[PDB]
Amino acid sequence: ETTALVCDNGSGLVKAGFAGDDAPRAVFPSIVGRPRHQGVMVGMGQKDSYVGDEAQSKRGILTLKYPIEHGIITNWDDMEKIWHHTFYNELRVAPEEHPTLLTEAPLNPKANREKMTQIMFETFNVPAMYVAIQAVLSLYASGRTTGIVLDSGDGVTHNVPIYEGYALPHAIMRLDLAGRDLTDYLMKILTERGYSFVTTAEREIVRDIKEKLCYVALDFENEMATAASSSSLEKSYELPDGQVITIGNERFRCPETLFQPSFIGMESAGIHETTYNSIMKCDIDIRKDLYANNVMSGGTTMYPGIADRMQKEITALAPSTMKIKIIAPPERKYSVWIGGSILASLSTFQQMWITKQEYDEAGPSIVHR
Numbered sequence: 001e002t003t004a005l006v007c008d009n010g011s012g013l014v015k016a017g018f019a020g021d022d023a024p025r026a027v028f029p030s031i032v033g034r035p036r037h038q039g040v041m042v043g044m045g046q047k048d049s050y051v052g053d054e055a056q057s058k059r060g061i062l063t064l065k066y067p068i069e070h071g072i073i074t075n076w077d078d079m080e081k082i083w084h085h086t087f088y089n090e091l092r093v094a095p096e097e098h099p100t101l102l103t104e105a106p107l108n109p110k111a112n113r114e115k116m117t118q119i120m121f122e123t124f125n126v127p128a129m130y131v132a133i134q135a136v137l138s139l140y141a142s143g144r145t146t147g148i149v150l151d152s153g154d155g156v157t158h159n160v161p162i163y164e165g166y167a168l169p170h171a172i173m174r175l176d177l178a179g180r181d182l183t184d185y186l187m188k189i190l191t192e193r194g195y196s197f198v199t200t201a202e203r204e205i206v207r208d209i210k211e212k213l214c215y216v217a218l219d220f221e222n223e224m225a226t227a228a229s230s231s232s233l234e235k236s237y238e239l240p241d242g243q244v245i246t247i248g249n250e251r252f253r254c255p256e257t258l259f260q261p262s263f264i265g266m267e268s269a270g271i272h273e274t275t276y277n278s279i280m281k282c283d284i285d286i287r288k289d290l291y292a293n294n295v296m297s298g299g300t301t302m303y304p305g306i307a308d309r310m311q312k313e314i315t316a317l318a319p320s321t322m323k324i325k326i327i328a329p330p331e332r333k334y335s336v337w338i339g340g341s342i343l344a345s346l347s348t349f350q351q352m353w354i355t356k357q358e359y360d361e362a363g364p365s366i367v368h369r
């Protein structure tokens with residue numbers, strides 16, 4: 001036992017690295033691609049499968065799969081390929097030398113955590129492992145053990161209330177909208193101005209425009225009203241062919257979808273309503289602690305303006321005397337991984353790891369509680 005590994009299994013991105021590093025060394029797409037024809041398989045190099053950017057480059061030829069599409073792992077043969085890629089191709093480690101901490105989505109079934117554990121020990125021969133809930137790790141990365149996390153990533157968004165380290169399962173809310181939807185919606189709305197962003201390459205360009213220029217308006221209708229005379233709304237962006245496009249109200253219309261899912265044709269409540277609905281499914285006596293500790297996590301919470309908008313919307317739904325605080329750490333794109341890194345580097349607590357001997361002696365029930 002020397003250096004622990006942290007693997008945050010994201011719906012769109014795997015974040016992995018060594019405990020104790022400040023950020024993950026390896027970040028790649030959680031996609032597996034498989035040829036559909038034997039001749040194509042052999043002609044492209046005899047590889048049975050491709051993972052990450054290699055898989056994405058071969059789209060249209062390979063069948064792509066997202067084995068963690070909405071945060072829960074649904075295909076174990078594909079997941080084994082992602083973990084093999086993580087260990088051998090990205091981190092370049094021998095997994096049998098490292099205790100490995102894995103993350104899991106809110107509401108992950110016990111049988112799913114058991115299958116994750118079985119693969120780590122039987123397939124990769126890790127010496128020890130541990131599974132932690134992603135939102136709890138993000139709460140720890142913010143330095144608290146009580147609070148409600150809003151975690152918006154690539155394929156899913158959750159609201160997870162947590163009391164003294166315990167996620168309250170009956171109050172967890174899941175919204176199947178997150179960054180991949182926002183990138184698709186920005187491609188569509190830019191195509192409204194006479195531009196054309198439709199190819200794989202164009203989606204990557206639009207993902208860059210989203211991450212660099214979008215923001216959350218404090219009020220959508222008033223921001224639209226200010227747009228005509230604003231001297232700072234319009235931004236220019238140079239494309240790869242040297243053309244320059246102008247982006248204006250699309251900067252805030254795109255992320256407005258998190259608060260108004262009807263923009264992409266979803267009937268769901270927006271993230272401020274799900275936050276409130278989650279707090280109201282908790283014991284009345286812990287709500288004050290949740291309202292004062294709303295922690296944002298995940299890549300899709302990176303927009304400038306999001307904390308102020310969430311403060312405004314939550315204030316409008318909560319009792320008038322309620323103290324409301326939104327915490328949006330600067331490193332929140334990686335706060336799940338960072339929480340895992342903090343936890344896995346606490347060698348004083350090395351007995352919390354599940355070792356291979358313990359698993360062999362106790363069975364699959366050992367990874368829970």
Ligand SMILES: Nc1ncnc2c1ncn2[C@@H]1O[C@H](COP(=O)(O)OP(=O)(O)O)[C@@H](O)[C@H]1O
Nearest residue numbers: 010011012013153154179180211298299300302
């Ligand atoms: N600065 C940013 N602004 C807006 N979205 C961002 C930013 N940085 C990353 N994202 C988006 O966040 C998503 C990835 O977030 P992440 O928390 O890693 O997701 P997951 O864990 O579900 O894979 C992608 O959709 C990405 O485009």
Ligand SMILES: [Ca+2]
Nearest residue numbers: 010011134153
């Ligand atoms: Ca995630």
Ligand SMILES: [Ca+2]
Nearest residue numbers: 026027028029
């Ligand atoms: Ca990468």
Ligand SMILES: [Ca+2]
Nearest residue numbers: 196197198199
């Ligand atoms: Ca084109």
Ligand SMILES: [Ca+2]
Nearest residue numbers: 219220221222
């Ligand atoms: Ca309004």
Ligand SMILES: [Ca+2]
Nearest residue numbers: 264265266267
């Ligand atoms: Ca619909």
Ligand SMILES: [Ca+2]
Nearest residue numbers: 351352353354
């Ligand atoms: Ca132990």
